[PDB]
Design a protein. Structure first.
Ligand SMILES: Cc1cc2nc3c(=O)[nH]c(=O)nc-3n(C[C@H](O)[C@H](O)[C@H](O)COP(=O)(O)OP(=O)(O)OC[C@H]3O[C@@H](n4cnc5c(N)ncnc54)[C@H](O)[C@@H]3O)c2cc1C
Ligand SMILES: Cc1cc2nc3c(=O)[nH]c(=O)nc-3n(C[C@H](O)[C@H](O)[C@H](O)COP(=O)(O)OP(=O)(O)OC[C@H]3O[C@@H](n4cnc5c(N)ncnc54)[C@H](O)[C@@H]3O)c2cc1C
Lengths: 366, 366
């Protein structure tokens, strides 16, 4: 018999969607190619709860980041998911950069982020004794979250509403059925075929390629699949700052974020590296260029202190010389396929936006 | 513009093409994402020089395997590339399988493979004392090759004719210029954009995805990109057979090949496992089902003797329930794009066919 809804991918976004579908009374099967939940791009990010500052007005990134932030802070408090509203400084390290702050704060305001504080460098140093900057914007609503815990929590909720998750179960090929619904061929060690009424393609890095593997999805609707890797490095011995530090959006060349984990340890990154294949191997040498970038706002960074961290890969749907694409949530109104939502290019701030992306997917599926 | 011919991929097929274009007088640049040559599917295969036996009549696999074999044996002998014409038995392990051998031999003959010997089980045992079968076909032209040495030889040839190879240089995005030629965005330590007159996409597992990242290549022309992994297990010590041993194609369930390397060690596999992502991790549990399959023809396979080997992934352009697609060699006559050849689905016997694939690529380019 048909399963009602199949969600492909058990990342944070796939799980938020499964959770929403199951809460709506639908039978849900989540198929994940990996051996567990949240091993993918949901385990290789900064884990920052973003405020919604610099996304373009009315973009999905802007709307879903701000809505998602509110839903997520409430969810974390309600469910006891570890998180901290520790705040962030966007720091200007030259007079030219300091001049950029006013417009950045106005963009945030227009997105519904109305708590930014514009302060001078001396004020910023009062807040953060180790910090060297010309001026800053304080973003008090920016936080951090344990994304693994968040994933498990979404999973728990969905299961409580009858969802079933099946691991090491890769979707290989599918077809839109003439009569409606989908027929799906799964691979791995135990290949099998299942059919369903609703299909959610939340496959992340692989969503566009996977859509191309489903007969009946228009090929002109599917974006190209690019990969933009990011590497993080860690700092042993407890952090020099109590808030996240971000250079200005338009900072020239490499902008190194200083972020914090829940245990209080600082990490640096991610950088940007366009690559041809899905390769998570950490190149420790990529830290070399971090030093001068970080020392612009934290000159006390010691030599050799940037220890190997980890990598992630962003799902890109536009190329290295194009302006960044918005999130793509493609439902029947754009591709013409009843019962299908493809999600493409859910890079940052996808974790922050996750519960809002779930809302929007259901809205579009309708 | 910058560059006459650019070849994407330094696997055995990309190198054969680069060698042919350079020999034809073209300035050639080969761009490879990895650090050296042949680190892709060209490093994870059986290394068998196939005879041309079972491929569909008039297919590219049939024609290029047979032509390729003759060119390859000549090349190896002329240049000193290590190889062995060891021969192969196709073995029937039941009365029903034995009844299939005549039609297999007829197919081979139609493909231009005229040297198969149809013999009984006793005769087969005289050749291979450890074999248990009802009947067999001997394929004396089947062999094995040192594929790394082969690729180094191809590279040397191309370089002798002016070719340049650049590594850690992934092609990220590109576009077809309306006036002809291509503009290509490369990553790596120093990202750069280059233009060229001729573009050969020999990107293997990623060829279809890469084609989709080149604006101007008709999207309907580009097949889906599937991945079909295969696992191998090795046998420590003395090999039981002096020829390769293949069960008949229509063998029920898993057919396990027994092949030999140039050092005389036996290995078993590969199996078939359709997967979602490029993961080469060997799962030792996959050997469990090999035992019964191998024992159909080598019942003396000892308990526990299947040691972890390695895996490879086949580039597929048709799905698990479709007939195996032919090699894809997609020039201007098919997609309309001047100076472009895309190679897709170059799985086995692509190593054997490599020099013939290069011939066909140049023919189709022109
Ligand atoms: C370096 C980096 C830093 C980031 N930092 C932040 C941040 O600080 N704050 C923030 O809000 N966001 C951040 N993000 C974004 C956030 O990490 C992602 O938006 C989020 O994890 C995406 O989750 P997802 O479910 O869409 O994708 P994924 O976690 O990638 O899940 C997709 C799943 O699909 C599975 N899959 C793929 N193909 C198949 C198939 N054929 N069959 C079955 N399963 C399949 C995969 O195994 C995977 O588990 C960052 C992203 C990156 C890359
Ligand atoms: C398990 C297995 C066993 C096999 N056994 C046999 C056999 O016994 N006999 C036989 O004849 N054939 C066999 N084959 C087939 C043979 O291995 C292949 O046909 C051959 O290796 C393919 O070579 P290639 O150059 O097309 O691909 P590859 O070797 O995969 O080369 C593609 C190259 O492109 C590069 N690349 C990808 N994307 C980019 C990018 N965007 N930019 C720059 N570079 C990029 C990759 O890094 C890679 O090096 C086997 C195949 C498999 C999977």
């Amino acid at each position: 018999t048909d399963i009602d809804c199949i969600v492909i991918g058990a990342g944070v976004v796939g799980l938020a969607i499964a959770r929403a579908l199951a809460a709506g009374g639908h039978e849900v099967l989540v198929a994940e190619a990996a051996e567990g939940i949240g091993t993918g791009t949901s385990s290789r990010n900064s884990e920052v709860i973003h405020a919604g500052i610099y996304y373009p007005a009315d973009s999905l990134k802007a709307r879903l980041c701000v809505r998602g932030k509110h839903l997520l802070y409430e969810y974390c408090a309600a469910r006891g998911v570890p998180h901290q509203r520790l705040g962030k400084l966007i720091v200007a390290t030259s007079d030219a950069e300091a001049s950029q702050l006013d417009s950045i704060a106005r963009r945030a305001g227009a997105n519904g982020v109305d708590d930014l504080q514009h302060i001078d460098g001396a004020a910023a140093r009062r807040l953060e004794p180790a910090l060297h900057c010309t001026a800053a914007l304080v973003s008090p609503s920016t936080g951090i979250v344990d994304s693994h815990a968040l994933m498990l929590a979404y999973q728990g909720d969905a299961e409580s509403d009858g969802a079933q998750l099946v691991f090491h179960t890769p979707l290989i090929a599918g077809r839109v059925r003439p009569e409606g619904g989908f027929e799906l061929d799964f691979g791995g060690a135990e290949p099998m075929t299942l059919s369903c009424r609703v299909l959610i393609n939340a496959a992340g890095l692989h969503a566009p390629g996977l859509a191309r593997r489903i007969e009946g999805i228009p090929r002109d609707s599917i974006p190209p699949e690019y990969l933009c890797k990011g590497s993080y490095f860690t700092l042993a011995g407890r952090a020099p700052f109590s808030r996240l530090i971000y250079p200005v959006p338009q900072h020239a060349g490499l902008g190194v974020h200083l972020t914090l984990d829940l245990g209080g340890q600082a990490k640096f990154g991610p950088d940007t590296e366009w690559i041809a294949t899905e390769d998570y191997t950490l190149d420790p040498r990529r830290a070399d260029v971090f030093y001068a970038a970080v020392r612009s706002y934290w000159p006390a960074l010691p030599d050799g202190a940037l220890a190997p961290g980890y990598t992630g890969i962003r799902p890109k749907i536009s190329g290295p010389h194009e302006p960044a694409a918005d999130f793509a949530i493609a439902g029947p109104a754009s591709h013409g396929v009843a019962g299908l939502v493809n999600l493409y290019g859910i890079e940052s701030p996808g974790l922050t936006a996750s519960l809002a992306i779930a809302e929007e997917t259901l809205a579009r599926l309708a």
